[PDB]
Design a protein around this motif. Structure first.
Motif, PDB file in Angstrom:
ATOM      1  N   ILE A 127       0.861  -1.205   0.000  1.00 19.48           N
ATOM      2  CA  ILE A 127       0.000   0.000   0.000  1.00 19.48           C
ATOM      3  C   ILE A 127       0.877   1.229   0.000  1.00 19.48           C
ATOM      4  O   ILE A 127       1.574   1.497   0.982  1.00 19.48           O
ATOM      5  CB  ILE A 127      -0.965   0.096   1.196  1.00 19.48           C
ATOM      6  N   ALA A 128       0.888   1.943  -1.121  1.00 16.76           N
ATOM      7  CA  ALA A 128       1.718   3.160  -1.305  1.00 16.76           C
ATOM      8  C   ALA A 128       1.038   4.431  -0.797  1.00 16.76           C
ATOM      9  O   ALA A 128       1.678   5.506  -0.659  1.00 16.76           O
ATOM     10  CB  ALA A 128       2.057   3.314  -2.790  1.00 16.76           C
ATOM     11  N   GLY A 129      -0.256   4.344  -0.547  1.00 14.48           N
ATOM     12  CA  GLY A 129      -1.050   5.489  -0.191  1.00 14.48           C
ATOM     13  C   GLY A 129      -2.495   5.181  -0.230  1.00 14.48           C
ATOM     14  O   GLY A 129      -2.898   4.059  -0.533  1.00 14.48           O
ATOM     15  N   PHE A 130      -3.307   6.187   0.074  1.00 10.84           N
ATOM     16  CA  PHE A 130      -4.758   6.075   0.046  1.00 10.84           C
ATOM     17  C   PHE A 130      -5.422   7.249  -0.618  1.00 10.84           C
ATOM     18  O   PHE A 130      -4.879   8.363  -0.649  1.00 10.84           O
ATOM     19  CB  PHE A 130      -5.367   5.934   1.454  1.00 10.84           C
ATOM     20  N   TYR A 152     -10.392  -3.940  -2.062  1.00 11.03           N
ATOM     21  CA  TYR A 152      -9.534  -3.534  -0.984  1.00 11.03           C
ATOM     22  C   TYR A 152     -10.041  -2.286  -0.311  1.00 11.03           C
ATOM     23  O   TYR A 152      -9.330  -1.749   0.528  1.00 11.03           O
ATOM     24  CB  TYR A 152      -8.074  -3.296  -1.445  1.00 11.03           C
ATOM     25  N   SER A 153     -11.215  -1.798  -0.673  1.00 14.08           N
ATOM     26  CA  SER A 153     -11.658  -0.512  -0.216  1.00 14.08           C
ATOM     27  C   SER A 153     -12.521  -0.656   1.043  1.00 14.08           C
ATOM     28  O   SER A 153     -12.823  -1.787   1.472  1.00 14.08           O
ATOM     29  CB  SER A 153     -12.449   0.203  -1.335  1.00 14.08           C
ATOM     30  N   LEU A 154     -12.874   0.469   1.629  1.00 18.48           N
ATOM     31  CA  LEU A 154     -13.855   0.531   2.706  1.00 18.48           C
ATOM     32  C   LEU A 154     -14.763   1.713   2.470  1.00 18.48           C
ATOM     33  O   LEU A 154     -14.384   2.651   1.751  1.00 18.48           O
ATOM     34  CB  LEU A 154     -13.145   0.678   4.055  1.00 18.48           C
ATOM     35  N   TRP A 155     -15.886   1.719   3.180  1.00 16.41           N
ATOM     36  CA  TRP A 155     -16.903   2.740   3.038  1.00 16.41           C
ATOM     37  C   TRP A 155     -17.291   3.281   4.390  1.00 16.41           C
ATOM     38  O   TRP A 155     -17.455   2.496   5.338  1.00 16.41           O
ATOM     39  CB  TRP A 155     -18.148   2.206   2.363  1.00 16.41           C
ATOM     40  N   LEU A 156     -17.400   4.602   4.434  1.00 15.00           N
ATOM     41  CA  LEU A 156     -18.028   5.325   5.525  1.00 15.00           C
ATOM     42  C   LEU A 156     -19.389   5.775   5.008  1.00 15.00           C
ATOM     43  O   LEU A 156     -19.482   6.298   3.916  1.00 15.00           O
ATOM     44  CB  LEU A 156     -17.177   6.519   5.930  1.00 15.00           C
ATOM     45  N   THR A 202      -2.248   0.366  -4.617  1.00 19.68           N
ATOM     46  CA  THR A 202      -1.337  -0.742  -4.632  1.00 19.68           C
ATOM     47  C   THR A 202      -0.916  -1.107  -6.050  1.00 19.68           C
ATOM     48  O   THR A 202      -0.190  -2.090  -6.251  1.00 19.68           O
ATOM     49  CB  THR A 202      -1.998  -1.992  -4.031  1.00 19.68           C
ATOM     50  N   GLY A 203      -1.319  -0.303  -7.031  1.00 21.36           N
ATOM     51  CA  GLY A 203      -1.012  -0.585  -8.434  1.00 21.36           C
ATOM     52  C   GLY A 203      -1.987  -1.544  -9.107  1.00 21.36           C
ATOM     53  O   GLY A 203      -1.667  -2.078 -10.167  1.00 21.36           O
TER      54      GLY A 203
END
Ligand SMILES: [Zn+2]
Ligand SMILES: [Zn+2]
Lengths: 115, 115
Positions: B7-10, B96-100, B86-87
Motif C-alpha cells: 500500500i503506497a497510499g490512500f 480492498y476498499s472501505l466505506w463510511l 497498490t497498483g
C-alpha cells in the motif's frame, strides 16, 4: 468538529456464516499472529446488535493503521464492521463506523435499549 | 497473505450532491486544515467509476490513522470511499476498499477498460 482524541480504541467485528466460517478462522489467526489485539469469543449466532455470527477484535488506536489496512487486503470476502470506542455505543456503531465488504443492517435498537 | 507494504497510499472519495455540497465543502476544509493531504478537483457530476459528484483526497500511509478516524467522526452524513493505492486499480476500488456511510455502486468495468 469533535476531536479524534475522543477515540479510546476500536473494535472490528468479523462476520461470517457456515460457508465462510473457515475463512473467518484464518483471518482471525492472521490478526492474532500479527497485531496487538484482544480477540473476543466466537459467536456462532447473532447476539446484541450483531445480525450474524461474528467475533470481536479489539485494539488501541495505535493499531488502526496496522489492522485495518491488513483487513482491507486479507479479509477474503468477509463483511467487517470497524467502530471506534468513544463512550457512545449507538453512534459508535451506527454513525462513526466503517465497513469492509458489504454493510449488514445492525440491530441498533438493542444498543438503544441498553442506554 | 497480502503485504500491506504493497500500500503506497490512500484516496478518500467524498461523494455529495447539491443538497450536501456545503457539508462536503466544510469537510474538505477540515481535511486541508488538519492533515497531510493532496486535495484533487471538485467534480459536481459523475466521472469515471464514480456514480455521484465527488472530490478526491490523497494521502501517504502515515495519515491513514489521522484522516480516516477524523472522517469517521466528522463526515456529517456524507458517503466516503477510502481505497488503497497498490497498483491494481480494479482491486483497489472493488475489493480492498472501505466505506463510511452507505456504499455507492462504482463502475468497476470503467477501470478494467483502462487495461
Ligand atoms: Zn464492538
Ligand atoms: Zn481514488
Amino acid at each position: 468538529k469533535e476531536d479524534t482524541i475522543e477515540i479510546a480504541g476500536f473494535h472490528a467485528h468479523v462476520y461470517f456464516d457456515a460457508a465462510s466460517r473457515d475463512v473467518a478462522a484464518r483471518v482471525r489467526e492472521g490478526l492474532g499472529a500479527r497485531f496487538e489485539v484482544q480477540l473476543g469469543r466466537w459467536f456462532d449466532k447473532p447476539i446484541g446488535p450483531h445480525p450474524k455470527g461474528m467475533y470481536q477484535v479489539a485494539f488501541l488506536p495505535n493499531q488502526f493503521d496496522k489492522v485495518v489496512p491488513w483487513l482491507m487486503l486479507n479479509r477474503e470476502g468477509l463483511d467487517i464492521l470497524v467502530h471506534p470506542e468513544t463512550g457512545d455505543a449507538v453512534s459508535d456503531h451506527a454513525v462513526y463506523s466503517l465497513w469492509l465488504g458489504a454493510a449488514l443492517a445492525l440491530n441498533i435498537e438493542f444498543l438503544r435499549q441498553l442506554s
